[PDB]
């Protein structure tokens, strides 16, 4: 394995991650309806949880990537020549199956990266982050070159352009995966493992439960429907959550530098750090309830989402890096991997529970009156 093949493998893994998260990033960017995001998250978490326990075949990854591509094609054709009711029904079922397929693809790619030397999990995560950044950048570039016709609440030209970009990325990732990857071929009981590393599980569910509680439907959906935020400004608001969330997962990794010495601190301090994250709930609600000019400001709205974005990824990698320090009775190498399975499961429950509790705020009269 010389430098050329290693570089190609790193590139194809980064590209697999990028093309897997492209669909979610463009669904966020296009201001799609909230229930579609909820369906996508539900499908993704269900598929990931199911695939964690079942050793699904590793040959099927290109097939489901092609299924994702044809689903994007169906999205385009439905936005083109389908009426509102059939478009809604399609888009919802397509988003459910898209979430399922994306979760399966992520699981298969991570399993491929793990069972090989010079792991590519870091490369896949970097690919996901670059997917978020790339979607934001192309959306910003595309905003001033597309007329906002707003056919079904989604810009026709923007949807077509973003989805053809996603399709070309998906097919070129397909060819990269086919060319590069080879698709031929005494432990303690779980109760003791759970009762020992319970803080790490709880500290990871809480951060993902709260972040996905707000950003989907209250992070920018309720702000724009209560303050009439322009579509140009919404892209900056939503698109800067996905550029600071990716940038926030690195500083924990470069702990050797003096500046980032205190970024990974402890597990006990993480619970009290997630309690301070609960102070984001009044701030997000206050941004959609007061007309006083400071709250109706693009920079404040951007910064308020930026702070949540930074504390999301930074608090999502810390429990992975410090939970081994807090372990007392789980000492074997096999239990370390088993506990890590509980952590990723605890996140998907956090994402699944995060989206659905957004409907709690529907009871409150948060949104300002139209006149």
């Amino acid at each position, epitope marked *: 394995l010389s430098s050329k093949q290693h570089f190609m493998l790193s590139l194809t893994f980064i590209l697999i991650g990028l093309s897997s998260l492209n669909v979610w990033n463009t669904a966020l960017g296009l201001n799609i309806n909230f229930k579609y995001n909820t369906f996508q998250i539900t499908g993704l978490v269900c598929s990931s949880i199911v695939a964690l326990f079942v050793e699904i075949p590793k040959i099927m990854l290109p097939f489901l990537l092609g299924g994702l591509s044809i689903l994007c094609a169906g999205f385009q054709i439905s936005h083109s020549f389908f009426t509102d009711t059939q478009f809604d029904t399609y888009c919802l079922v397509a988003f459910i199956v898209i979430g399922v397929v994306a979760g399966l693809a992520q699981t298969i790619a*991570f399993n491929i*990266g*793990s069972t090989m030397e010079d*792991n590519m*999990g*870091g490369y*896949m*995560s*970097a690919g*996901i*982050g670059i997917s978020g950044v790339f979607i934001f950048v192309i959306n910003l570039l595309l905003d001033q070159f597309v007329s906002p016709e707003k056919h079904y609440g989604v810009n026709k030209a923007k949807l077509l352009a973003l989805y053809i970009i996603c399709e070309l990325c998906l097919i070129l990732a397909i060819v990269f995966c086919v060319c590069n990857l080879d698709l031929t071929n005494a432990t303690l009981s779980y109760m003791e493992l759970f009762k020992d590393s319970y803080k790490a599980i709880l500290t990871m569910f809480l951060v993902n439960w709260l972040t996905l509680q707000l950003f989907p439907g209250v992070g920018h959906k309720k702000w724009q429907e209560s303050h009439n935020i322009s579509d140009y400004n919404v892209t900056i608001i939503v698109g800067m959550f996905q550029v600071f969330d990716f940038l926030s*997962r*690195y500083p924990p*990794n470069l*702990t*050797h530098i003096k500046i980032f010495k205190n970024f990974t601190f402890s597990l006990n301090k993480l619970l009290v750090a997630n309690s301070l994250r609960l102070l984001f709930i009044p701030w997000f609600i206050l941004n959609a309830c007061v007309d006083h000019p400071f709250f109706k400001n693009i920079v404040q709205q951007c910064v308020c989402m930026a702070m949540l974005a930074f504390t999301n*990824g930074w608090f*999502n*990698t810390v429990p*992975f*890096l410090v939970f*081994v*320090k*807090e*372990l*007392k009775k*789980a*000492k*074997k*190498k096999k239990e*370390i*991997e088993i506990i*890590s399975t509980f*952590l*990723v499961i605890a*996140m998907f429950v956090g994402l699944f529970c995060g989206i659905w509790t957004t409907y709690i705020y529907n009871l409150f009269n948060i949104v300002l009156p139209k006149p």
Partner: nanobody
Amino acid sequence: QLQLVESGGGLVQAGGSLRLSCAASGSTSNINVMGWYRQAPGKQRELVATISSGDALNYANSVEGRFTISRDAAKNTVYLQMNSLKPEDSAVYICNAYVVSSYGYRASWNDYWGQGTQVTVSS
């Protein structure tokens, strides 16, 4: 890359005592648990003793009460003390590291092995 340096092996009489030093240079803080593995000639690899980052002590059932392994987080060096050596422990001990690569939403672990030292006891 990640490099491991081991020293202390040799030929000593039965019931002796040796101190094995293992140090890491490439990865500084991502190491979670370091340990020692022995491989007898004509035999498969086996675990000897591992110390985690949170001072968690693991041992093989055949070395309990005889081997003491200590860590020095200041320079990322792990030392193993062997007491009352016996002929069946004649093997090659290779230091091992356990690095977590967890850039987010997925934790993956790697094993880094040094060249190891040959320890033989006879007479």
